[PDB]
Design a protein around this motif. Structure first.
Motif, short mmCIF file in Angstrom:
data_model
loop_
_atom_site.label_atom_id
_atom_site.label_comp_id
_atom_site.label_asym_id
_atom_site.label_seq_id
_atom_site.Cartn_x
_atom_site.Cartn_y
_atom_site.Cartn_z
N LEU B 11 0.88 -1.18 -0.37
CA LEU B 11 0.24 0.00 0.45
C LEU B 11 0.77 1.05 0.04
O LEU B 11 0.46 1.94 -0.56
N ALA B 12 1.95 1.10 0.68
CA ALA B 12 3.09 2.32 1.16
C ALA B 12 2.66 3.63 -0.79
O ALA B 12 3.77 4.12 -0.90
N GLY B 13 3.57 2.12 -1.37
CA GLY B 13 3.24 2.74 -3.17
C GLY B 13 2.51 3.68 -3.73
O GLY B 13 2.59 4.82 -4.02
N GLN B 14 1.27 3.10 -3.65
CA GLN B 14 -0.21 4.14 -3.91
C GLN B 14 -0.73 5.11 -2.96
O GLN B 14 -0.66 6.17 -3.75
N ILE B 15 -0.30 4.99 -1.73
CA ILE B 15 0.10 5.84 -0.47
C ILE B 15 0.58 7.26 -1.30
O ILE B 15 0.01 8.55 -1.24
N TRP B 16 1.86 7.05 -1.63
CA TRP B 16 2.92 7.94 -1.61
C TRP B 16 2.73 8.13 -3.48
O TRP B 16 2.57 10.32 -3.07
N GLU B 17 1.96 7.49 -3.76
CA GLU B 17 1.97 8.31 -5.31
C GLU B 17 0.76 9.22 -5.15
O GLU B 17 -0.19 10.90 -6.22
N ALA B 18 -0.17 9.21 -3.96
CA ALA B 18 -1.31 10.36 -3.98
C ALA B 18 -0.91 11.89 -3.60
O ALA B 18 -1.26 12.87 -3.78
N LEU B 19 -0.01 10.85 -2.70
CA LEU B 19 0.79 12.49 -2.32
C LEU B 19 2.03 12.90 -3.70
O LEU B 19 2.68 14.38 -3.56
N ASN B 20 2.37 12.69 -4.35
CA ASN B 20 3.14 12.58 -5.38
C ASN B 20 2.71 13.76 -6.73
O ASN B 20 1.40 13.44 -7.06
N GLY B 21 3.24 14.81 -7.18
CA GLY B 21 2.69 15.58 -7.23
C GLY B 21 1.69 16.79 -7.02
O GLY B 21 1.63 17.81 -7.90
N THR B 22 2.09 16.57 -5.88
CA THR B 22 0.21 17.67 -4.63
C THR B 22 1.25 18.37 -3.58
O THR B 22 2.70 18.28 -3.14
N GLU B 23 0.75 19.19 -3.56
CA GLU B 23 1.20 20.00 -1.66
C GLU B 23 0.65 19.95 -0.58
O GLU B 23 0.86 19.78 1.17
N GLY B 24 0.73 17.96 -1.10
CA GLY B 24 0.00 17.16 0.21
C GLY B 24 -1.49 16.92 0.35
O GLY B 24 -2.02 17.93 0.27
N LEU B 25 -1.73 16.14 0.77
CA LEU B 25 -3.92 15.29 0.95
C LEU B 25 -3.61 14.99 2.19
O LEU B 25 -2.95 15.05 2.58
N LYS B 31 -7.44 8.08 0.14
CA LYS B 31 -7.69 7.30 0.74
C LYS B 31 -8.56 6.71 -0.52
O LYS B 31 -9.52 5.95 -1.04
N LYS B 32 -9.35 7.84 -1.68
CA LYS B 32 -10.35 8.28 -2.81
C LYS B 32 -9.33 7.84 -3.74
O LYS B 32 -10.40 7.15 -4.83
N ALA B 33 -7.96 8.36 -3.98
CA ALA B 33 -7.19 7.76 -4.95
C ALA B 33 -7.09 7.15 -4.87
O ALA B 33 -6.43 6.16 -6.14
N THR B 34 -6.02 6.04 -3.95
CA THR B 34 -5.90 4.74 -3.92
C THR B 34 -6.93 3.73 -3.54
O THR B 34 -6.18 2.35 -4.62
N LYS B 35 -8.37 4.19 -4.20
CA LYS B 35 -9.66 3.29 -3.97
C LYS B 35 -9.72 2.36 -2.82
O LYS B 35 -9.90 0.90 -2.41
N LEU B 36 -8.68 2.75 -1.38
CA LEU B 36 -9.03 2.17 -0.12
C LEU B 36 -10.86 1.92 0.05
O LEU B 36 -10.86 2.99 0.55
#
Lengths: 77, 77
Positions: B11-25, B31-36
């Motif tokens: 999961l650490a891969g997709q949680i990081w990808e949600a934060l990748n290219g953002t000011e933080g989420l 959870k929405k972006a990762t489909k958890l």
């Protein structure tokens, strides 16, 4: 500048000490021995035990069963 | 083989990808972006980001906010 990491490290100590002196507990028995009011604190502390490889985690009957690394385990669940 | 530590690392891969290219989420934006389906899984992914210090944690209005440790665009609180 006080991080949620410092919190997670204090949680890690008491969860490790709950698994210290026993052969293994599930999520209900761990939060019982640690005095954890919520599972929320269990997830942060447990993850810190995983980073240092002090414990092994697996599912037993829907419970998060955790114990100190004494021997290798192929319990894939 | 397949442990509850192993899915924490996965999961650490997709949680990081949600934060990748953002000011933080926040926890819900990731959870929405990762489909958890359950938030319980998010804490195990985020905990793996904390173990290697590749993120910074904060609290916004009683909800979990996290950002990548890369830089500091600190606008407002």
């Amino acid at each position: 500048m006080k991080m949620l990491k410092e919190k997670a490290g204090a949680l890690a100590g008491q969860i490790w000490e709950a698994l210290n002196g026993t052969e293994g507990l599930t999520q209900k028995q761990i939060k019982k021995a640690t005095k954890l009011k919520a599972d929320k604190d269990f997830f942060l502390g447990l993850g810190w035990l995983l980073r240092e490889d002090k414990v092994v985690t697996s599912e037993v009957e829907g419970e998060i069963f955790v114990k100190l690394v004494l021997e290798h385990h192929h319990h894939h669940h």
